[PDB]
Write a protein that binds this ligand. Structure first.
Ligand SMILES: Cc1cc(C)n(-c2ncc(Cl)c(Nc3ccc4c(c3)CC(=O)N4)n2)n1
Ligand SMILES: Cc1cc(C)n(-c2ncc(Cl)c(Nc3ccc4c(c3)CC(=O)N4)n2)n1
Lengths: 122, 122
C-alpha cells in the first residue's frame, strides 16, 4: 500500500502561512469592523463552517471582500485566523470569551469544544 | 503558551482535497502531454520547488495553464498530485522510476529522498 508522510500536512500548512505572510495568491479580505485581514478562501473554507457555507455557494464564490458581523471582536478573529494557518491556538483568561464567541460565529466546532474544555479546566 | 491541535494540518489538507475533487477555487490546469490536471496553485507551491519558483515570480503568478515538459509521464504526475493533497505516496516497482523522475523535475526533495530509500530497501 501507500507510504505515509507524517509531517507533510504540517509542512503544507507552514508553506501556506508563508504565502499568506507575503500576500501570495490571497484572494479575499475579511473586514472585522476597523480591521482588515487578507487570506486564502480555500484555507478559510477548510477551517470554518461559515466560510465553507459562503464560498461553496456559486453566488458568493467569487467575492473579494467579506464584511463580518460588526459585533465580532477583531482580536478574536485575528487569533483564529492565525490558528487556521498554524494549528496553534492562543487561549488566555483575557481572550477566552472573545475567542469562543468568534469560533461559534465562524462555526469552528473543534475550537468551540476546546474553549469549553479551557473553561472546564479553569 | 499556545494549544497545539495535532490533527488540524491533516484536517485542512483533507478539506483542500475535497475542494479539489469538487473543482472549488482551483485556479490552474497542469497539462502533462495528453492529460490535464486541475489544482490550487497555493498547494502546488507548498509541495514543489518548481511550482514555487513559477508562481512566486510576478510574471507567471497569474497563469491559468502550465504546460509541463512533454517527457513527463502523466501517471507519475498524477501519483505526485494525489501525494500533495493526501500525504500518501503510492510507490511500486512498476512506477518507482517514473515517480522519482517526476519528483526530481518537480523539485520535491523529500519525495526524491523517499524514492532513493525505496530503491535502497528493494
Ligand atoms: C464530506 C464533507 C462534508 C463537509 C462539510 N466537507 C467539507 N468539505 C470541504 C471543506 Cl473546505 C469543508 N469545510 C468545513 C465545513 C464545515 C466545518 C468545517 C470545515 C469546520 C467546522 O467546524 N465545520 N468541509 N466534506
Ligand atoms: C523560508 C522559506 C524558504 C522557502 C523556499 N520557503 C517557502 N515558502 C513558501 C512556499 Cl509555498 C515554499 N514552497 C516550496 C519551495 C521549495 C521546495 C518546496 C516547497 C518543496 C521542495 O522540495 N522544495 N517555500 N520559505
Amino acid at each position: 500500500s501507500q507510504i505515509q508522510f507524517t509531517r507533510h500536512a504540517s509542512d503544507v500548512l507552514l508553506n501556506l502561512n508563508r504565502l499568506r505572510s507575503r500576500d501570495i495568491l490571497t484572494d479575499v479580505v475579511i473586514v472585522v469592523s476597523r480591521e482588515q485581514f487578507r487570506a486564502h478562501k480555500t484555507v478559510l473554507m477548510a477551517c470554518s463552517g461559515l466560510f465553507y457555507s459562503i464560498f461553496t455557494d456559486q453566488l458568493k464564490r467569487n467575492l473579494s471582500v467579506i464584511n463580518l458581523d460588526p459585533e465580532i471582536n477583531p482580536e478574536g478573529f485575528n487569533i483564529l485566523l492565525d490558528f487556521m494557518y498554524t494549528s496553534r491556538l492562543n487561549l488566555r483568561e483575557g481572550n477566552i470569551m472573545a475567542v469562543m464567541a468568534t469560533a461559534m460565529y465562524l462555526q469552528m466546532e473543534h475550537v468551540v469544544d476546546t474553549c469549553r474544555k479551557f473553561i472546564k479546566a479553569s
